[PDB]
Design a protein around this ligand. Structure first.
Ligand code: HEC
Ligand code: HEC
Ligand code: HEC
Ligand code: HEC
Ligand code: HEC
Length: 385
C-alpha cells in the first residue's frame, strides 16, 4: 500500500523504456543478493542478506549499507532483503522518486546521515515537472498521477500521486545522499565523489552526464565502472614520441573528462598504464612495469589508499589517515614521460586499464566472476617508430 513498497514492475506497464534501462543498471542490482562484489563485502561485514535482525559486525548497528544499497529495506527497518520486491529491487523507481528534500549528509551535530537518511521522504512520487494542470481544472496513456486510479488493459492501477519537485529531481540533490561521501569509523573518507566535485569547481548537475536525453527522455541506464563504453569515453588518452639521442622520449597524456576524480567512488577502484616497446617481430624490448604498476611503476598506478598513524597502508575499516591518492583529479590532464632505449624498437604501445577492485582483492577473491575482476582495457594508443 505505501508507495515505497510498489514494485518497479508496476511502473514498467507505462514506462517500459526507462524500466529496460533501469533493470540493467547497478541501481537495480545494488543489493547483496544481486551484486556479488557488494555481496561478498556485505557478508563479511554484516552477515546474511536473507536474515532479519542483522547488524554490522563491528558497530552492532542496523547495517548502514542498506541506507544506500537497499533503501526501501532500510525505510522499513528490515535486513531481510529477499522478503519483498521493494527490497530485492535495490535502488528502484520509488526509492529515488520518493526523495523529497535533501538535508545534507552531516547534521548540525556532526552525525553523518547516509542515503535515505540524508533526505526528507515523501509518500508521493516526485517528478521534474509533474502535471501542473490547476489552470486547466480552474477553467473547465492512462495517467495514474492525476489524483485517481486508472484502468489499463482491464487492470486497475492504483492512484500514484505525484508532486512537482524540480530542485530535487534536476540537481545533484537527486544523487548526493548516496554518492557524496562515506567515511570509515575513524572519519577517513572511503568514497568522496562530492568533495572531489566541490574541489574541481564544476557547476554541471550529475544528470547532465549520467541521465542524458536520448530518444527524448532522461536515460536511466546510469552506467559507470561496470560499463566499458562509458569507461572509454571517460578520458582522452594519447601517446607521442620524439627521438632523444639513442632513446625514444615517449609522452603519455591522459585527460580526465569528469568533474570528479577518475576513478571516483569506491575506494578500491584503480587504473594502471602499461607502456611497451616492441621489435618488428612483436617481441617485447622494454616495458614500464614488468608486472603490476602498483609495484613496478607507481606513477603509472592511479589509485587511493588508506593508512595508519605511521602512513603505512591499512585496511579501510581500521585506517586512521588517508593514504596517497594518485587518481586523476577533477578535469586533470596528467603527462607521464618515459625514456625508452631505441635499439630495435618498431612500435610503442600504451594501454590504460580500469579495475573495479585492487589487485590484492582480485588475488584473494578468485571466486568472483572473472568478467568482473579482469582488468578492463579502456584506452589504447600505438606509435610506429
Ligand atoms: C500508466 C498506467 C502509468 C503507470 C503504471 C505509471 N505511470 Fe508514470 N507516467 C504515466 C504517464 C502517462 C506519464 C506522462 C508521460 C508519459 O510517459 O507518457 C507519467 C509520467 C511520469 C513521470 C514524469 C512526470 C514529469 O515530470 O514529466 C514520472 C517521474 C513517473 N511517471 C513515475 C512513475 C513511477 C515511478 C511509476 C511506478 C511507481 C509510474 N510512473 C507508473 C503513466 C503511468
Ligand atoms: C535514481 C537513481 C532513480 C531511479 C532508480 C529511477 N529514477 Fe526516474 N528519474 C530520476 C531523476 C533524477 C530524474 C530526473 C532527470 C533530470 O535530470 O531531469 C528522473 C526522471 C524520470 C522520468 C521523467 C523522464 C523524462 O521525462 O525525461 C520518469 C518517467 C522516470 N524517472 C521514471 C522512473 C521509473 C519508472 C523508474 C524505475 C524503472 C525510475 N524512474 C528509476 C531518478 C531515478
Ligand atoms: C560529465 C561531465 C559528468 C558529470 C557532471 C558527473 N559525472 Fe560521474 N562520471 C562521468 C563519466 C564519463 C564516468 C565514467 C567513469 C567511471 O569511472 O565509470 C563517470 C563515472 C561515475 C561513477 C562511477 C565511478 C567508478 O566506480 O568508476 C559514479 C559513481 C559517478 N560518476 C557519480 C557521479 C555523481 C554523483 C555526479 C554528480 C555529483 C557525477 N558523477 C557527475 C561523467 C560525469
Ligand atoms: C541511493 C539511494 C542512491 C541514489 C539516490 C543514487 N545512487 Fe547511484 N548508486 C548507488 C549504489 C548503492 C550504487 C552501487 C551499487 C552496487 O552494488 O554496485 C550506485 C551506482 C551508481 C553508478 C555506477 C554504476 C556502475 O556501472 O557501477 C553511477 C554512475 C550512479 N550510481 C550514478 C548516480 C546518479 C547520477 C544519481 C542521481 C541521479 C544516483 N546515482 C543516485 C546508490 C544511489
Ligand atoms: C551510501 C553512502 C553508501 C553506503 C552507506 C554504503 N555504500 Fe557501498 N556503495 C555505494 C555506492 C554509491 C557505490 C558505487 C560506487 C562506484 O564507484 O560506482 C558503492 C559500491 C560498493 C561496492 C563496490 C560494488 C561493485 O563494484 O559492484 C562495495 C563492495 C560496497 N559498496 C560495499 C558496501 C558495504 C559492505 C557497505 C556497508 C558496510 C556499504 N557498501 C555502504 C554507496 C554506499
Amino acid at each position: 500500500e505505501p508507495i515505497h513498497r510498489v514494485s518497479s514492475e508496476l511502473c514498467a506497464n507505462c514506462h517500459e523504456d526507462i524500466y529496460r534501462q533501469w533493470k540493467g543498471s547497478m541501481h537495480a542490482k545494488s543489493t547483496a543478493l544481486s551484486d556479488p562484489i557488494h555481496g561478498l563485502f556485505y557478508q563479511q561485514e554484516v552477515g546474511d542478506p536473507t536474515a532479519e535482525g542483522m547488524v554490522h559486525k563491528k558497530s552492532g548497528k542496523f547495517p548502514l549499507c542498506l541506507y544506500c544499497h537497499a533503501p526501501n529495506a532500510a525505510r522499513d527497518q528490515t535486513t531481510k532483503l529477499d522478503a519483498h520486491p521493494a527490497y530485492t529491487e535495490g535502488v528502484n523507481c520509488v526509492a529515488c522518486h520518493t526523495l523529497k528534500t535533501y538535508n545534507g549528509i552531516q547534521d548540525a551535530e556532526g552525525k553523518l546521515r547516509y542515503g535515505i537518511k540524508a533526505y526528507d521522504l515523501s509518500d508521493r512520487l516526485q517528478a521534474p515537472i509533474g502535471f501542473p494542470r490547476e489552470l486547466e481544472r480552474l477553467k473547465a496513456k492512462p495517467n495514474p498521477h492525476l489524483g485517481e486510479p486508472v484502468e489499463l488493459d482491464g487492470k486497475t492501477i492504483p492512484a500514484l500521486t505525484m508532486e512537482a519537485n524540480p530542485r530535487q529531481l534536476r540537481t545533484s540533490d537527486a544523487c548526493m545522499g548516496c554518492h557524496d561521501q562515506r567515511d570509515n569509523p575513524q572519519g577517513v573518507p572511503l568514497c568522496q565523489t562530492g568533495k572531489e566535485f566541490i574541489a574541481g569547481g564544476s557547476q554541471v548537475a550529475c544528470q547532465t552526464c549520467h541521465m542524458p536525453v536520448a530518444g527524448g527522455f532522461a536515460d536511466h541506464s546510469m552506467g559507470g565502472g561496470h560499463h566499458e563504453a562509458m569507461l572509454k569515453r571517460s578520458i582522452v588518452f594519447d601517446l607521442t614520441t620524439k627521438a632523444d639521442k639513442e632513446k625514444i622520449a615517449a609522452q603519455v597524456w591522459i585527460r580526465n573528462l569528469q568533474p570528479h576524480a577518475m576513478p571516483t567512488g569506491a575506494p578500491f577502484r584503480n587504473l594502471y598504464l602499461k607502456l611497451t616497446a616492441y621489435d618488428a617481430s612483436g617481441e617485447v624490448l622494454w616495458q614500464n612495469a614488468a608486472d603490476h604498476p602498483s609495484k613496478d611503476d607507481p606513477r603509472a598506478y592511479f589509485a587511493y589508499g588508506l593508512a595508519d598513524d605511521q602512513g603505512n597502508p591499512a585496511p579501510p575499516p581500521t585506517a586512521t589517515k588517508p593514504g596517497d591518492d594518485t587518481r586523476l583529479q577533477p578535469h586533470e590532464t596528467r603527462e607521464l614521460n618515459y625514456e625508452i632505449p631505441a635499439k630495435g624498437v618498431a612500435l610503442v604501445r600504451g594501454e590504460l586499464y580500469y579495475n573495479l577492485l585492487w589487485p590484492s582483492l582480485v588475488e584473494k577473491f578468485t571466486q568472483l566472476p572473472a568478467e568482473l575482476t579482469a582488468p578492463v582495457l579502456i584506452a589504447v594508443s600505438e606509435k610506429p617508430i
